Design a protein around this ligand. Structure first.
Ligand code: MN
Ligand code: MN
Ligand code: MN
Lengths: 502, 246, 244
């Protein structure tokens, strides 16, 4: 049975409110969450995190922040659309929404905003440089089966000890979790354990994009293939994640019903914006672009969504009055045209498949592969791939980023290349005799990730044989948090500073 | 004539509130002083301490919440505390004075001078003025900015220091013989503000005695638009580029 | 064997005194904290407070002089310290003069057990607040890499045979080793000279001769580096890393 009262959980993890609360009181809790997010430094960092193009001397180009604001307005429209359609179907009161109208919408916007929030400095390239750096040091492939006589793992404790132990399963999980860093998974880690925001369960649900654990090694459930496409959470969050499922009434590997709306918005805002910026960076003319889009469509019909969107927007741009620029008018209406056709589709799709979406079991996207909508998006993507993403200044920066992170990770290798007894020593005494470089390097780490490490560690049993393995898992996590937390600029600046060129 | 849009008052209010507290958060972030040091500067600033005053209800309240990140919790609840008392006030004020606000004749702010609310804001402002706005790195940049703009304006003086007959000539032919610096300088101007100038000019009657005066008004507007349109970075970058240091 | 020169103890003392107070003056100068903030960190650090202790006589004393600021504070704090510590060490020297004359005395003029305490107090405050500052630590780490990297740049001269290295010492221009040539030219003429001299004093025939050559080779490299200023070493690091 579909009841959103049961999905829109206004309770929190710590200092949680309880008992009755009015429509207004509830709105205020969700409005509180907005203020929390909007004032977060983690949200400010995004104006200094690159989105496709390098951080140019003129803000004409979109940053991770400006893009996420755009995504959020798309999300707003979709949510608003679902709602309006449902009020016309009268099912609003019936699905327990008549009083959670505003909240629903806010959650979408706020989740939209917080997509990419957990992304590292150089995004997908950052992920690579992290995962790769860890892979050469852990080799999680060497853990998959039986204890290898020649285990490529650089860590004594994580190396699979010979023909014995269920501890061998703990080593397997740690190696896969640390080597499979994902922005979304880091995002969950961030809002709770790192940023210590204490958001409504419902909100945190909306930013849980994937149901796959980072430690997962095998083939993905056939029935849950799509939902476990990428990892959604770390081993460090497994506990809290369980807490989240129970609060939001989710089965193991079940998605929060609103996440689908936020996802959709990000699948649309995705390209068009960078395509606008492409013509802005003079890569080609708006005319040149139109012709690349015509070339890309091929199977041309006079009533297709190409004609209705792209052909339509092209005609508006030519003999465009309003004294408005050709390019401006073009992109302006192209954006409009897209949303005006795609938003209704996804809004409908949601409502159409609502029981499976409510269950969070629905193994598909709102704009799925077969849809003329998915095709239009793909068209933008293809053009962007073949012309924009391929540009040398992009690629240069992509390569640059990789080295910055890799090098930075190597600068911090000494902290990892250490014994527990020694490392712990450094945690208690801030000034350690024999390890002065390690001391200073540990001081370079941000007070929040530092704090978080200690807390996770203090919760473990000293006596436990798994305790040293955990320490290392957390140690790596701590380092990962520092790095992923940085902006493209800070990470690059630090790389040069620690390479000694400033 | 001279009447304000009824909603403008709401937007205004939000800015008066957000105005300081954020920079004060950033002040402790830039290490100008501790969160503790700041609390003491706020205690010093209040002076007339009594009652279950809004200071106690907001600042004293937020200070206690922070003790058992400290800074995060402090600002987080200080913000909360403020909004939780100020927003209702202005919301009421609006409704209370709605006829004059609807008229857009109401000669006051939602948070007006006498209100304990206005006082709290002023308190933040005073502390910010005396400690944050007064910091050398701030002031350095403030002075720097002044020169950048002034210098930039001087770089573009040649376009203004011209006759209509000459200037117009430059607008039609993109390449002008005798004025090459002016040519290149006019090219530097952004296509939108350029377009806007021409449009305002083409709307004027050629015959009119006021026509030359208008042209100049617009010419200056055009220049002003270019500059105002720039970011702190672009204006600085351009200043250096046009001063030839890159 | 293992006996110290009787005056060394006097020089040592002054260094141990000057040691902190100056950096503490500079700390307030770099705005790390106020002179007032510092006084409170010193009050916190003393703990076992008595109204006649050296804290009262020196720090509390200098604090009162400053009020009816920073200049006066440090000026008199310095005074206060020397005015009590110098006599102590002067006495200590005279008191333990036979063992000091012998250079066998297994202790410092300002021991461990009230003067040593006052110094330690300054040190603790400096450690916990000044030496811990990120800009300090950043530079400390920076320095490490500069030297390490520089040492690696000169590794080719060490990663060589005697027969080859010696060849480079005679002929300034060597065919096959041009990088090594140029790198050896980068070395300062004095440390270079010194190496050759130590080498020429060894017996050619000796089986220890190649070991000595290497010992000296490394010494020579060490001399070059140690001889550099913070600036020159950093500048050279960048220049030899090719970024100028
Ligand atoms: Mn996106
Ligand atoms: Mn403002
Ligand atoms: Mn010394």
């Amino acid at each position: 049975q579909i009841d959103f009262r049961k999905k829109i959980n206004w309770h929190r993890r710590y200092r949680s409110p309880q008992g009755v609360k009015t429509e207004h009181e509830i709105l205020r809790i969700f409005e509180s969450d907005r203020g929390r997010i909007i004032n977060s430094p983690a949200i400010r960092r995004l104006q200094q995190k690159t989105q496709v193009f390098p951080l140019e001397r003129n803000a004409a180009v979109r940053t991770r922040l400006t893009h996420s604001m755009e995504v959020q307005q798309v999300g707003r429209y979709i949510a608003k659309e679902i709602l309006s359609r449902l009020k016309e179907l009268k099912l609003l009161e019936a699905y327990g929404l008549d009083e959670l109208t505003g909240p629903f919408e806010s959650i979408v916007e706020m989740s939209c905003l917080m997509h990419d929030i957990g992304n590292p400095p150089f995004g997908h390239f950052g992920e690579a440089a992290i995962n790769d750096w860890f892979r050469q040091r852990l080799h999680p492939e060497d853990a998959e089966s039986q204890p290898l006589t020649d285990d490529r793992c650089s860590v004594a404790a994580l190396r699979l000890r010979d023909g014995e132990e269920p501890l061998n399963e703990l080593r397997r999980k740690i190696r896969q979790d640390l080597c499979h860093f994902e922005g979304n998974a880091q995002g969950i880690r961030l809002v709770h354990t790192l940023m210590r925001m204490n958001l409504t369960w419902a909100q945190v649900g909306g930013i849980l994009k994937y149901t796959r654990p980072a430690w997962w090694r095998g083939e993905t459930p056939e029935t849950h293939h799509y939902l476990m496409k990428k990892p959604g959470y770390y081993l460090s969050e497994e506990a809290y994640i369980a807490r989240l499922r129970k609060e939001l009434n989710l089965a193991l590997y079940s998605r929060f019903p609103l996440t689908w709306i936020m996802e959709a918005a990000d699948d649309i805002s995705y390209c068009v914006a960078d395509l606008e910026d492409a013509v802005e960076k003079r890569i080609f003319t708006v005319e040149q672009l139109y012709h690349h889009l015509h070339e890309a469509w091929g199977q041309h019909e006079k009533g297709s969504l190409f004609s209705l969107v792209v052909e339509n927007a092209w005609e508006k741009s030519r003999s465009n009055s309003l004294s408005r620029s050709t390019e401006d008018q073009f992109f302006m209406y192209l954006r409009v045209n897209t949303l005006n056709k795609l938003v209704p589709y996804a809004a409908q799709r949601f409502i159409d498949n609502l029981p499976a979406i409510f269950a969070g079991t629905f193994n598909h996207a709102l704009l799925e592969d077969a849809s003329e909508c998915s095709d239009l998006l793909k068209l933008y993507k293809n053009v962007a791939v073949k012309h924009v993403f391929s540009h040398p200044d992009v690629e240069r920066l992509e390569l640059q980023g990789y080295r910055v992170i890799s090098g930075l990770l190597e600068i911090y290798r000494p902290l990892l290349s250490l014994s527990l007894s020694d490392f712990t020593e450094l945690v208690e005494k801030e000034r350690v005799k024999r390890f002065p470089i390690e001391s200073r390097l540990f001081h370079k780490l941000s007070t929040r990730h530092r704090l978080a490490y200690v807390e996770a560690v203090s919760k473990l049993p000293s006596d436990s044989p798994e305790f040293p393995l955990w320490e290392y898992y957390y140690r790596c996590r701590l380092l990962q948090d520092y790095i992923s937390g940085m902006t493209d600029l800070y990470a690059w600046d630090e790389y040069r500073r620690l390479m000694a060129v400033e």
